[PDB]
Amino acid sequence: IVGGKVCPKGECPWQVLLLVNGAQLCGGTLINTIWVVSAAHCFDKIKNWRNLIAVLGEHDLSEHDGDEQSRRVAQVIIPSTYVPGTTNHDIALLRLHQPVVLTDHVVPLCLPERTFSERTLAFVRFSLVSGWGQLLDRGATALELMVLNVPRLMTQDCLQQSRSPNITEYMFCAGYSDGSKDSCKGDSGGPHATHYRGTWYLTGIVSWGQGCATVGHFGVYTRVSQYIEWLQKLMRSEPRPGVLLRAPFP
Amino acid sequence: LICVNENGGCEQYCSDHTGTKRSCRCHEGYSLLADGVSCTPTVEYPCGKIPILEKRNA
């Protein structure tokens, strides 16, 4: 995250850290006790699928304070329409091997209904993005979880204001074009969380952008509202052997 | 009332029904109040609420 602030410990309780062989891979969002939403592109280069770990209740990566909860990732589900190395359909649904325990520091973000998300949440201007990604373009990653308030743009306005992948119906733009504030590498997969009448909802996934905080460009987020029914169906399904599952979309 | 305008007055989810009808609904871990629009938690850790801030204003 570029130009944000430290998320006070426990105020981003749905944030997930994904690790591979103990190394920082990506962010994610807890949506109930066994299910995490992340970005498909986070898994393009995974060699050992059995060493993926999700950490909940993380805050300061330099210390252990006892609020952290680690779980093996039992399943990574990716839409059939996602092509590795490209930007469209950038979503993954992760099943944990064992549920996390909900606590003051571990709480799921609500996955909204589609209609609610499209008709109401999509018009809330500002939303929060968070992660342990790079604090600057070409810079070091954060040791404390960072958070940033970003405004959403209509895709026609994003394309007009921006000056190379297309912005599809499965994406949206948010952030700033003045190079001050943005998500960045390392934040991929993390939440874009939207507040409405006292409650927070998952509306986007940190996906991509032209560098980070690049003048004339905005951050691009997976439009989660397109995947609600796909996610809901998968969460009712029984696990299959093997970690990676490609599932038909729609 | 219609769900496209003002969320149909619902705090959370809204369904249109045939005629001038509307039903509000709540996420798992919440129940709908008798006003027919408001949602109240039914569990300790409902989704989308931040416990340390909920206690900070409780």
Ligand SMILES: Nc1nc2ccc(NC(=O)Cc3cccc(Cl)c3)cc2[nH]1
């Ligand atoms: N401002 C800003 N936020 C970002 C967050 C993440 C990234 N990371 C990538 O762009 C790498 C990437 C490569 C190929 C396909 C995909 Cl979908 C993604 C860049 C970002 N730029």
